[PDB]
């Protein structure tokens, strides 16, 4: 099963995470490597692609940080 999920995240929380990932590997590339998923970003939305289970696991991690 191949899934592609698009969900809203806090704009200010996503703002701070992108800045920290610049000064740094990366919180997102760690999830992408760990879950074998593809993340895309522009509250705004981010987009995760991959296996149904991997997308579900990437979303649970991202949403815990970028909660709403």
Cα 63 to Cα 68: distance, rounded to the nearest angstrom: 8
Six-digit token pair at 55?
């997308």
Six-digit token pair at 43?
């509250």
Six-digit token pair at 65?
């940080």
Cα 48 to Cα 42: distance, rounded to the nearest angstrom: 12
Domain that holds residue 65: 1-68
| 35: nearest Cα among 5, 67, 8 | 5
Q: Are 38 and 50 in contact (CB under 8 A)?
A: yes
Which technique was the structure solved with, according to the deposited record? X-ray
What was the resolution (in A) of this experimentally determined structure? 2.0
Contacts of 52 (CB under 8 A, 6+ apart): 1, 2, 3
Burial 18-43 (b: 16+ CB within 10 A, else e): eeeeeeeeeebeebbeebebebeeee
Cα 41 to Cα 39: distance, rounded to the nearest angstrom: 7
Beta bridge partners of 49: 4, 38
Q: Based on the structure, what is the number of domains in the chain?
A: 1
Q: Are 66 and 9 in contact (CB under 8 A)?
A: yes
């Amino acid at each position: 099963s191949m899934s592609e999920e698009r969900f809203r995240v806090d704009r200010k929380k996503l703002e701070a995470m992108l800045q920290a990932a610049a000064e740094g590997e990366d919180f997102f590339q760690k999830i992408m490597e760990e879950t074998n998923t593809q993340i895309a970003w522009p509250d705004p939305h981010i987009k995760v692609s991959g296996k149904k289970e991997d997308v579900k696991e990437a979303k649970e991690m991202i949403m815990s940080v970028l909660d709403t």
